[PDB]
Assembly symmetry: C3
Amino acid sequence: HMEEIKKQVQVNVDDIRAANIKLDGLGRQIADISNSISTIESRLGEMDNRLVGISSQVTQLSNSVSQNTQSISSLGDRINAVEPRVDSLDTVTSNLTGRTSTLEADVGSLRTELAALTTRVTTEVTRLDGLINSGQNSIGELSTRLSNVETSMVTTAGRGLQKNGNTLNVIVGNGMWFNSSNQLQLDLSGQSKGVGFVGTGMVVKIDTNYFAYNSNGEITLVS
Amino acid sequence: GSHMEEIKKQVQVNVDDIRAANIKLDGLGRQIADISNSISTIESRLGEMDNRLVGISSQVTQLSNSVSQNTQSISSLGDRINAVEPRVDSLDTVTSNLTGRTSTLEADVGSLRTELAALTTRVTTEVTRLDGLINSGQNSIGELSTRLSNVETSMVTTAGRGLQKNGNTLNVIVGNGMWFNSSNQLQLDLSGQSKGVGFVGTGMVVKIDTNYFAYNSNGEITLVS
Amino acid sequence: MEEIKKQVQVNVDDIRAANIKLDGLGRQIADISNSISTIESRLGEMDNRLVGISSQVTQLSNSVSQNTQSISSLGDRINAVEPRVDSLDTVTSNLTGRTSTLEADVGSLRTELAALTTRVTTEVTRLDGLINSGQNSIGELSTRLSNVETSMVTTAGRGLQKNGNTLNVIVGNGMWFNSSNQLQLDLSGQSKGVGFVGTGMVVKIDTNYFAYNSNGEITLV
Ligand SMILES: [Cl-]
Ligand SMILES: [Cl-]
Ligand SMILES: [Cl-]
């Protein structure tokens, strides 16, 4: 009885000792786990700061991207506006380039036709002066013919003549008349008063019973 | 005895208590193991997050470079559009001024061609008219030529028989026995009618003494007795 | 027997000391368990924030990609336009000079044409005056002829005859023309009782039988 209780007391001494050993091993393991807790919480706080920093940069980046999107859209509308203006300018200037070239051709045509008309005016004036000069000469010839008519014409009746209009008349006193042939003749009183014609010749008419003509042409008496 | 039993009872309580302590130590080990399982889990999650964090900030650096380049590209593009826009304004000005001046030139050479065509016709029209007057002049010259020829052939210019031309005066010219009175009438010289020739009226006669001479029926001087 | 009781009492004390240490470990476990709960709340919240940042970043990547393409596209269009404007610059400044030269050329044409138009008027006026002065001269000649036609002899009246341009006296009995073209009397050669003494006509008489009395008649002596 005494020996049995004494042995269970020593067994208790050894079990207590062993339990303290086992207890100390668990306490060490708990101390390791607390070290891990502290390491985890440090990492947690460090990671939270990095999270804030990154999310901050990402939001700041997104502000710059939205500004860029907005600018691109604005640039897009400006380029949209410029292109048709340039289209229209191409159409306009290509038509002007043709129209200018045609104008240069038309101006050279005008110069040619003006130059030729200038020479034509000179040519024809010179020609018409030539015809006028020839005509003036002809007039001078007529004028010469008029002067010759003027200096050879008869305008004035002199001795024995009388002008009536454009007619001249011989004017005569006694002893002469004009016969039915318009000839100037002597008037011998119808040859009944001693003087007569023999042919064209004047004679004294004589009774040849009593008169003759002698060799002097005088009248004389016969027998 | 009674004191031996009190020791025995405490020794038994101590056996029970050591047993209790060992079961409590087993329960602490269970809880320690469960906690280590939670820590394990936590460490794995921290590892996922750390890796994702490194990936993200790396992705953000490359994105940053692309954005910076885009912003810089955009500025350059804005400068080219800003330069081009007033050039187009300027071209709108030149082409609209060229348009007006070209239309004006086109109407101008239209007018010129019309003016030049009228002047050509005028030159034709006047040369015709002038040739007209010259050819009419030639008509008049001929008409006057003909009138001069007609006058040339009909006029008296030359003194013929019994005549003499002094200047533009004509005179009858006479031999012996003829003269002209104050009136320019031609006359005969009858010797004052004192030598047997006389006038009675306009006619000539032999002036005769009628004691001795008479005219016979035949017109001859005869003797009366 | 007393030493047995003393070790029992020591064992009671040691058991009490071990239970005290056991409770201390239990406290630590409780604190640690609370840390674990707190750690899992904080982690869950941080994981959600990370997912949100990742989602934002991938959206941003795609938006940045689109912007880079649009930029390139815009650069193409600017690059298409710039040389077109350059060419239009050149061509319109050439056209500007060609237009100005055309304007100077059309101006010269107007000037020259206006002078030619005036030249035509000037020369027609000079030529018309020459023609008019020539009509006047013919007119002068015509009226001068007319006035000489009313005064000139053209027609033969009494004792005259016209042959061409020659006017002749014509004569019958008793008259003829001597070889000085003079009119003269035909007295039958003065053989027939009529003749001249000096300038005067006489009855030629044999003065052995006849004479002239005071009355000029022929009588017997
Ligand atoms: Cl961007
Ligand atoms: Cl004990
Ligand atoms: Cl003329």
